[PDB]
């Protein structure tokens, strides 16, 4: 089965792409990474940094997750990210997304040994 660490990579990692403005990016990526298959995932963030640099966040600042869990980690630097959010007309199975580039600290929940990102929690 897909591991928790691989699911994070499929859902949130896009290291090869730059922060260049790209208005259709989320419509393309939300489908390609299977985040529109069973429902429209309402919000999803992709990170344009290396996998090593994102895995390293699990050793950075321990902070509370949005839900109250306490195994989240905030990156010391802001990172090049893309926020994908459903549009007002989006309705499954016809999902549609707005793309927004940002530079923000990422917050991920980490698990396992080795200790790696398994959930993308927030950017601030």
């Amino acid at each position, epitope marked *: 089965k897909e591991t928790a660490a691989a699911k994070f990579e499929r859902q949130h990692m896009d290291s090869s792409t730059s922060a260049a403005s790209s208005s259709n990016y989320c419509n393309q990526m939300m489908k390609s990474r299977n985040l529109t298959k069973d429902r429209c995932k309402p919000v999803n963030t992709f990170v344009h940094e290396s996998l090593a640099d994102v895995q390293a966040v*699990c*050793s950075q*600042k*321990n*902070v*509370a997750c949005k839900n109250g*869990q*306490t*195994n989240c*980690y905030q990156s010391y630097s802001t990172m090049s990210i893309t926020d994908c959010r459903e549009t007002g007309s989006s309705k499954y199975p016809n999902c549609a997304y707005k793309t927004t580039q940002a530079n923000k600290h990422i917050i991920v*929940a*980490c*698990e*396992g*040994n080795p*200790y790696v990102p398994v959930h993308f929690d927030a950017s601030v």
Partner: nanobody, 123 residues
Framework: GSQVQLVESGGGLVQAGGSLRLSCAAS????????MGWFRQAPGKEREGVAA????????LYADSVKGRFTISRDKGKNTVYLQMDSLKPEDTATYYC??????????????WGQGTQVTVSS
């Protein structure tokens, strides 16, 4: 210095009915771990959470088999956690591990681990 290290002390060999104190001080991390806790692996058994506590001294949780006998504390230094173990039983024999940076007693959520300290309770 550059590495996070969870330094464990105390533990060791003790007779049943006796007491031990385990201590763990994390060095190398400049901020505060929200949760720290103690885990153990007894001979013949999977690793289990023994006690955990958040940096405010709250969120305190204990394995049912040690409630009323073990006391966890975090009031004795930044990123330090102590486990006072009284009325020790032979089945408390195990390698005890300090852990930091996780949530409650869920061992998969903790990313920093001590190397493990033997506790042996003889009958």
């Amino acid at each position: 210095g550059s590495q996070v290290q969870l330094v464990e002390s105390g533990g060791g060999l003790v007779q049943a009915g006796g007491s031990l104190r385990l201590s763990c001080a994390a060095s190398g991390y400049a901020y505060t771990y929200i949760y720290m806790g103690w885990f153990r692996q007894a001979p013949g058994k999977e690793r289990e959470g023994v006690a955990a506590m958040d940096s405010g001294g709250g969120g305190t949780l204990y394995a049912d088999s040690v409630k009323g006998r073990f006391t966890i504390s975090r009031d004795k230094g930044k990123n330090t956690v102590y486990l006072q173990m009284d009325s020790l039983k032979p089945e408390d024999t195990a390698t005890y591990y300090c852990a930091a940076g996780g949530y409650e007693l869920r061992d998969r959520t903790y990313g920093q681990w001590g190397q493990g300290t033997q506790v042996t309770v003889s009958s």
